[PDB]
């Protein structure tokens, strides 16, 4: 038969009170139009696994996750190339200008502001590593987590 | 019962006091279909004259049912029927536990059972297929206090083994009659080969009654049924979690 | 790809099993004919068998505050919805430090990573 996808979407996507686009990786994304928010896609691919959906088989054992994303990482590639396809709809969302004033009518990229903003996320992920309890030594561990979402991490 | 199944007759008063003799013989070792049974027979040493009349050397299905009825005051029995799913799971498990070692651990179990019930066993007879030298030494080391004897001609040599063989053969027949057109059940039979091929599921394969562990059962699955691959045929965080960034959708 | 919330709100419940083996070709399978009547409730979860191999199962629920969906294909409609899935392991139930168990801890961690 046809191809099936096992997803784990956020609870608020059920009520009406969404589109999937292939945007360039900063290092597939889901975006809302009615609610205005950007989400990333993550697939769980383990060697030797297959699903048994009701009365049908699905090889691979792929588990997709609809997890939120801060647009500051996605929109960063647009001003990273200067140093000093579906990308158009990605930026044009309410409350973007106030969000822009952390990294970058006129808009200019800054390194000093980006360095302070990235240093706050490391201290923000260190608490998640303390809440979810991931196996201080957390400094390099929390730094390595943001490195999978930005290419400037090599310089940081 | 779960995997295997043990059916037993109550221990007769004579067995617990007078010195007894045990016999071990199997039925259903070679078929791809159905379960495997193991039966033991025990009688006091002076009552060997009575069993001398109900001993073979072959016997027909009607005659074996008749012989089983006579054995059923001094003669005691115990069965051990291993399901075809249990046989499939024993051999196909992550650690290979061959039919030879599966059959022989079922033999030592029933002998222990008789010793656990209180039967005054002094000597044990065993029926094998090929070399008994390695089989005798293993059962002699397991039961050091009793004289263990293993022979391939045991069923034709002693009446205790023939009675234990009739009990294993009738139980094997009763079990397949309870399930009931395949033929005999053995891989060599062309009617059996024809039945298996007509009962193959692309995802699942054969039912519980089919011993998958057999080379005959494993070959057919590779042709008709779908290919199934098992466990044996920073970047560090996601590699340890088995997660990766999506690009497929 | 794009799809409404009406299909996500009117999706019938589903039964899911995560096998530790891969079944190469997708399509219909008679689960309720072979796998379902084979399932045995034990002290160490559930026990069934596939291709003559003993499997030990354990019921694994969707992370707190989330819901599981099964999508089929631009528009990709949700054919069904679930709250839990049966996790299976070869000979013994999959341990606490399994790759499947690790990925479920992610949205709880991800809720504080992308925080404002």
Swiss-Prot record, chain A:
Family stated for the protein in its record: Belongs to the RNase H2 subunit B family.
Gene source species:
Homo sapiens
Expression by tissue, per the entry, reads:
Widely expressed.
Q: How does it assemble?
A: The RNase H2 complex is a heterotrimer composed of the catalytic subunit RNASEH2A and the non-catalytic subunits RNASEH2B and RNASEH2C.
Task: State where it is primarily located.
Answer: nucleus
Disulphide bridges: none
Where is the protein found, in the record's own terms? Answer: Nucleus
Q: What does this protein do?
A: Non catalytic subunit of RNase H2, an endonuclease that specifically degrades the RNA of RNA:DNA hybrids. Participates in DNA replication, possibly by mediating the removal of lagging-strand Okazaki fragment RNA primers during DNA replication. Mediates the excision of single ribonucleotides from DNA:RNA duplexes.
Q: Which UniProt keywords apply?
A: Acetylation, Aicardi-Goutieres syndrome, Disease variant, Nucleus, Phosphoprotein
- The range of the complete sequence contained here reads 12 to 226 of 312
Q: Which domain of life is it from?
A: Eukaryota
Output this protein's name. Answer: Ribonuclease H2 subunit B
Q: Quote the cellular component terms of the Gene Ontology held in the record.
A: nucleoplasm; ribonuclease H2 complex
User: What disease is this chain connected with?
Assistant: Aicardi-Goutieres syndrome 2: A form of Aicardi-Goutieres syndrome, a genetically heterogeneous disease characterized by cerebral atrophy, leukoencephalopathy, intracranial calcifications, chronic cerebrospinal fluid (CSF) lymphocytosis, increased CSF alpha-interferon, and negative serologic investigations for common prenatal infection. Clinical features as thrombocytopenia, hepatosplenomegaly and elevated hepatic transaminases along with intermittent fever may erroneously suggest an infective process.
So what does mutating residue 51 to L actually do? In AGS2; reduces stability of the RNase complex
GO BP of this protein: fibroblast proliferation; gene expression; in utero embryonic development; mismatch repair; negative regulation of gene expression; positive regulation of fibroblast proliferation; regulation of DNA damage checkpoint; regulation of G2/M transition of mitotic cell cycle
UniProtKB/Swiss-Prot annotation, chain B:
Under what name is this protein listed?
Ribonuclease H2 subunit A
- Which reactions appear under catalytic activity for this entry? Endonucleolytic cleavage to 5'-phosphomonoester
Could you say what the effect of mutating residue 28 to S is? In AGS4; strongly impairs enzyme activity but not interaction with RNASEH2B and RNASEH2C
Subcellular location, in the record's words? Nucleus
- Note describing how the cofactor binds: Manganese or magnesium. Binds 1 divalent metal ion per monomer in the absence of substrate. May bind a second metal ion after substrate binding.
Q: Which UniProt keywords apply?
A: Acetylation, Aicardi-Goutieres syndrome, Disease variant, Endonuclease, Hydrolase, Metal-binding, Nuclease, Nucleus, Phosphoprotein
Q: Where is the organism placed in the taxonomic lineage, from the top?
A: Eukaryota, Metazoa, Chordata, Craniata, Vertebrata
Instruction: Report the cofactors.
Output: Mn(2+); Mg(2+)
Listed Pfam families = RNase_HII
> How does this protein assemble?
The RNase H2 complex is a heterotrimer composed of the catalytic subunit RNASEH2A and the non-catalytic subunits RNASEH2B and RNASEH2C.
From Swiss-Prot, chain C:
Entry keyword Phosphoprotein: yes
In its UniProt entry, the species of origin is given as Homo sapiens (Human)
* InterPro entries, per the entry: RNase_H2_subunit_C, RNase_H2_suC
Q: Where in the cell is it found?
A: Nucleus
Biological role stated in the UniProt entry: Non catalytic subunit of RNase H2, an endonuclease that specifically degrades the RNA of RNA:DNA hybrids. Participates in DNA replication, possibly by mediating the removal of lagging-strand Okazaki fragment RNA primers during DNA replication. Mediates the excision of single ribonucleotides from DNA:RNA duplexes.
Matches recorded under PANTHER family = RIBONUCLEASE H2 SUBUNIT C (PTHR47063:SF1)
UniProt note on tissues of expression: Widely expressed.
Cleaved signal peptide residues: none
Q: What is its main location?
A: nucleus
State the similarity comment.
Answer: Belongs to the RNase H2 subunit C family.
Additional detail: The T6 pseudogene located upstream of SRY on chromosome Y is derived from the transcript of this gene.
* Cysteine pairings via disulfide bonds: none
Know the name of this protein?
A: Ribonuclease H2 subunit C
Q: How does it assemble?
A: The RNase H2 complex is a heterotrimer composed of the catalytic subunit RNASEH2A and the non-catalytic subunits RNASEH2B and RNASEH2C.
Q: Which CDD domains match?
A: RNase_H2-C
Top-rank taxon of the source lineage equals Eukaryota
* Protein's GO biological process: mismatch repair; RNA catabolic process
């Amino acid at each position: 038969g046809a191809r099936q996808h096992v997803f784990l979407v956020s609870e608020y996507l059920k009520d009406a009170s969404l589109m999937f686009v292939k945007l360039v990786n900063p290092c597939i994304y889901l975006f809302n139009m009615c609610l205005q928010q950007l989400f990333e896609v993550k697939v769980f691919k383990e060697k030797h696994h297959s699903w048994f959906i009701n009365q049908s088989v699905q090889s691979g054992g792929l588990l997709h996750f609809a997890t939120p994303v801060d647009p500051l990482f996605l929109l960063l590639h647009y001003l990273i190339k200067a140093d000093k396809p579906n990308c158009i709809l990605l930026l044009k969302l309410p409350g973007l200008e106030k969000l822009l004033h952390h990294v970058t009518k006129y808009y200019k990229y800054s390194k000093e502001k980006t360095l302070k903003w990235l240093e706050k996320k490391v201290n923000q992920t260190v608490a998640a590593l303390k809440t979810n309890n991931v196996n201080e030594d957390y400094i390099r561990y929390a730094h390595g987590l943001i490195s999978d979402y930005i290419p400037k991490e090599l310089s940081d | 019962n779960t995997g295997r199944c043990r059916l037993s007759s109550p221990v007769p008063a004579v067995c617990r006091k007078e010195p007894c003799v045990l016999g071990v013989a199997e039925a259903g070792r070679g078929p791809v279909l159905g379960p495997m049974v193991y039966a033991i027979c025990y009688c006091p040493l002076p009552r060997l004259a009575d069993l001398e009349a109900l001993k073979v050397a072959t016997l027909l299905e009607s005659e074996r049912e008749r012989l089983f009825a006579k054995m059923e005051d001094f003669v005691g029995w115990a069965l051990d029927v291993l399901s075809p799913n249990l046989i499939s799971t024993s051999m196909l498990g992550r650690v290979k536990y061959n039919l030879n070692s599966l059959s022989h651990d079922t033999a030592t179990g029933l002998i222990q059972y008789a010793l656990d019930q209180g039967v005054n066993v002094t000597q044990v007879f065993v029926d094998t297929v090929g070399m008994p030298e390695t089989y005798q030494a293993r059962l002699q080391q397991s039961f050091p206090g009793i004289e263990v004897t293993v022979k391939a001609k045991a069923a034709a040599l002693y009446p205790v083994v023939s009675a234990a063989s009739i009990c294993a053969k009738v139980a094997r027949d009763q079990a397949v009659k309870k399930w009931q057109d395949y033929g005999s059940g053995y891989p060599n039979d062309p009617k059996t080969k024809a039945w298996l091929k007509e009962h193959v599921e692309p995802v699942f394969g054969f039912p519980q009654f089919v011993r998958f562990s057999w080379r005959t059962a494993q070959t057919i699955l590779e042709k008709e049924a779908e290919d199934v691959i098992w466990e044996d045929s920073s970047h560090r965080y996601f590699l340890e979690r088995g997660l990766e960034s999506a690009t497929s959708l | 790809v794009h799809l409404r919330s009406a299909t996500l709100r009117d999706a019938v419940p589903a039964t899911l099993h995560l096998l530790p083996c891969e079944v190469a070709v997708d399509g219909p399978a008679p689960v309720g004919r072979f796998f379902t009547p084979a399932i045995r409730q034990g002290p160490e979860g559930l026990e069934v068998s596939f291709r003559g191999r003993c499997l030990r199962g354990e019921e694994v629920a969707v992370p707190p505050g989330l819901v599981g969906y099964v999508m089929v294909t631009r528009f990709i409609g949700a054919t069904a919805n679930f709250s839990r899935f049966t996790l299976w392991g070869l000979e013994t139930i999959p341990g606490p430090d399994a790759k499947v168990r690790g990925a479920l801890t992610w949205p709880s961690l991800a809720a504080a990573i992308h925080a404002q």
